[PDB]
Design an enzyme around this catalytic site. Sequence first.
Site, PDB file in Angstrom:
ATOM      1  N   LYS B  25      -8.165   4.015  -5.361  1.00 44.69           N
ATOM      2  CA  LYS B  25      -8.469   3.848  -3.946  1.00 44.69           C
ATOM      3  C   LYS B  25      -9.972   3.988  -3.749  1.00 44.69           C
ATOM      4  CE  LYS B  25      -6.375   5.993  -0.178  1.00 44.69           C
ATOM      5  NZ  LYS B  25      -6.310   6.924   0.980  1.00 44.69           N
ATOM      6  N   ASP B 116       0.022  12.467   9.269  1.00 49.49           N
ATOM      7  CA  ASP B 116       0.187  11.020   9.165  1.00 49.49           C
ATOM      8  C   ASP B 116       1.406  10.771   8.282  1.00 49.49           C
ATOM      9  OD1 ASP B 116      -1.103   8.324   9.820  1.00 49.49           O
ATOM     10  OD2 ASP B 116      -1.002   8.210   7.636  1.00 49.49           O
TER      11      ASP B 116
HETATM   12  N1  ADP Z   1      -0.041   4.103  -4.376  1.00 48.57           N
HETATM   13  C1  ADP Z   1       0.035   2.807  -3.721  1.00 48.57           C
HETATM   14  N2  ADP Z   1       0.714   1.881  -4.376  1.00 48.57           N
HETATM   15  C2  ADP Z   1       0.851   0.627  -3.858  1.00 48.57           C
HETATM   16  N3  ADP Z   1       0.285   0.342  -2.667  1.00 48.57           N
HETATM   17  C3  ADP Z   1      -0.406   1.287  -2.001  1.00 48.57           C
HETATM   18  C4  ADP Z   1      -0.540   2.521  -2.512  1.00 48.57           C
HETATM   19  N4  ADP Z   1      -1.263   3.259  -1.659  1.00 48.57           N
HETATM   20  C5  ADP Z   1      -1.578   2.485  -0.619  1.00 48.57           C
HETATM   21  N5  ADP Z   1      -1.046   1.269  -0.835  1.00 48.57           N
HETATM   22  C6  ADP Z   1      -1.332   0.348   0.238  1.00 48.57           C
HETATM   23  O1  ADP Z   1      -2.693   0.799   1.011  1.00 48.57           O
HETATM   24  C7  ADP Z   1      -2.505   0.635   2.299  1.00 48.57           C
HETATM   25  C8  ADP Z   1      -2.657   1.996   3.010  1.00 48.57           C
HETATM   26  O2  ADP Z   1      -3.929   2.065   3.622  1.00 48.57           O
HETATM   27  P1  ADP Z   1      -4.041   2.825   5.111  1.00 48.57           P
HETATM   28  O3  ADP Z   1      -4.144   1.788   6.200  1.00 48.57           O
HETATM   29  O4  ADP Z   1      -5.247   3.700   5.142  1.00 48.57           O
HETATM   30  O5  ADP Z   1      -2.712   3.722   5.349  1.00 48.57           O
HETATM   31  P2  ADP Z   1      -2.155   4.166   6.860  1.00 48.57           P
HETATM   32  O6  ADP Z   1      -1.560   2.957   7.555  1.00 48.57           O
HETATM   33  O7  ADP Z   1      -1.073   5.256   6.707  1.00 48.57           O
HETATM   34  O8  ADP Z   1      -3.303   4.707   7.681  1.00 48.57           O
HETATM   35  C9  ADP Z   1      -1.060   0.106   2.471  1.00 48.57           C
HETATM   36  O9  ADP Z   1      -1.076  -1.191   2.715  1.00 48.57           O
HETATM   37  C10 ADP Z   1      -0.370   0.387   1.113  1.00 48.57           C
HETATM   38  O10 ADP Z   1       0.624  -0.664   0.812  1.00 48.57           O
END
Ligand code: ADP
Lengths: 62, 290, 284
Positions: B25, B116
């Site tokens: 990330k 969250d």
């Molecule tokens: N460990 C993971 N494996 C596969 N996809 C992930 C993973 N972590 C995040 N994603 C993707 O990253 C994105 C999450 O980013 P974010 O917008 O910050 O989360 P949120 O909506 O809870 O605020 C999602 O689209 C998710 O599918």
Amino acid sequence: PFNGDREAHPPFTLKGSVYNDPFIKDLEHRKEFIASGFNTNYAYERVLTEAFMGLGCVISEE
Amino acid sequence: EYTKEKKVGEGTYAVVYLGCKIAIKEIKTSKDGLDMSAIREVKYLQEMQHPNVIELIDIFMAYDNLNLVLEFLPTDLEVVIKDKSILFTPADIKAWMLMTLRGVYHCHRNFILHRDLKPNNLLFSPDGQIKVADFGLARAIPAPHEILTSNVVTRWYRAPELLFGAKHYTSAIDIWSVGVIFAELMLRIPYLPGQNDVDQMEVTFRALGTPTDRDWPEVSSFMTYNKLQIYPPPSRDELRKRFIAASEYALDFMCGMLTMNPQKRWTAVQCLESDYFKELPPPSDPSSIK
Amino acid sequence: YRHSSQYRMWSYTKDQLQEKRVDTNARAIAYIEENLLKFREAHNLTEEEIKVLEAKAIPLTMEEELDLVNFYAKKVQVIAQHLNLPTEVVATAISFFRRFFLENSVMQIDPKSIVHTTIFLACKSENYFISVDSFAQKAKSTRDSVLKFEFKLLESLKFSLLNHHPYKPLHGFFLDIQNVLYGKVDLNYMGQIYDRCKKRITAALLTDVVYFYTPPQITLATLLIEDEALVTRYLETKFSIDSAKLLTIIRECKSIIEDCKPPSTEEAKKIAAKNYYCQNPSTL
Ligand SMILES: Nc1ncnc2c1ncn2[C@@H]1O[C@H](COP(=O)(O)OP(=O)(O)O)[C@@H](O)[C@H]1O
């Protein structure tokens, strides 16, 4: 058998009807403090268990 | 690790990578230098170790950005929205609820909020253990005199004190969310939707009831309770109608989890032993999830 | 506590911490002795002056660094208390500054610029919520001097950005005294304890005690100022954990906290002109 939480229980005791704290027991008499779910035993359980975290030594460092 | 492959995520805040078993990330640094929701999401996910909250192998520094690690497999939201009714109320509704409440209790006993909680925040694993992650708006439980924020959790999974405007709340707002995860899992529909407005309050009043003066006290101290009128709370005729795929002990801790009272809301130390997992059948982690 | 970030990688012993001091003074000697042999393009005239500044800088700042960083820790403590901050964020700023200078020395990163960045990362750490320009107008910063030493501070800090501090053990042992004891309670213990032990733990965070023992042990060490009837009657009646080992741990923590020596106004001269600027004098 089974356990709901595998290892999540401390053995210390607590008694929230004893203390005379001048920072939370007077703070809970207000209107908007109660309305967000605040009570005295949650804060005391938060702070007293934090007061007993880590009673170890320096021998347990190597 | 210094390994990368194809990207996931079209969001401009962060685009996550993948590689090795892990998922990098990256927070784009290029106002302020570093955002609140980067140090705010590394500083509590660094110090938790559990089989229900993911951990950091390495947090090695990039040239301008910040790198983390994550988990490979997709989340609970794609499980619910697209299947052919694999999920069955004997065993599949119990194990995931047990593991999510184990992760919520491990967050709670570290005195960390994690405000969250979504099915796209709860993600599974190759061995099927559901994880609690994405600590982007998490906070330590502060001193009681410290003012917190307001809009901290998403619309469909919002505690009603956060609808009313509780500025300095407790950590009972994240049991309401996982109770809505329970109802969303056993109903296979997005539970309590709103029209991108204040309409979440009216649909929550229409679903579970406008709180009365006699029962959840001091609800009139928000300058929002006088805007609307009272609605009838649901009786136990909800056992068959609209919730017919449920057990006897599921509605007890569901109604104890969807208490709109936050002081009388069941904490996770009395949700892990709420005699619902004691009822037959016992759960098991091999579940038919693609 | 063993799952926390303060135990598993920044809690030390006396031999390990002194080894940490001598390795950050041993890894930061060759680059600085290489960067201060820079003479003129043709030849060097003032040989004796550049060798006495070399003797002032290179084999002398291996022990001048510790009371130098204690002096600048006192500086960042008084300027964090100057700009109306809570005691929690002052403690995190002191810990972030000291944890920055455990891994780097004061010469290859100057300590006069870190002291404004640590308050910024401390207030953005546990949600103080100051802005950048509002922090700059309340300080002597022009928005650039608080942000350039930010990535490397988190790199040398290795992202242990949550710290456990003895003030919540103060509010815990403010209450656990009254629960187990009822004979002589809460007259002097609310008279002259909350206004004294707080300042003693700010003075403790100025010293080197939080890398040694857990914050409840530092709390019970600083509660031993009034050991006439409080601490001995507390730990005898509490008793899984033996008592006498904990009394010896608290007693050796008191032996650590009593080896105190304040700063001076001499350390300033060595770094004021000898490093990076005195040369200019030699040149002209
Ligand atoms: N460990 C993971 N494996 C596969 N996809 C992930 C993973 N972590 C995040 N994603 C993707 O990253 C994105 C999450 O980013 P974010 O917008 O910050 O989360 P949120 O909506 O809870 O605020 C999602 O689209 C998710 O599918």
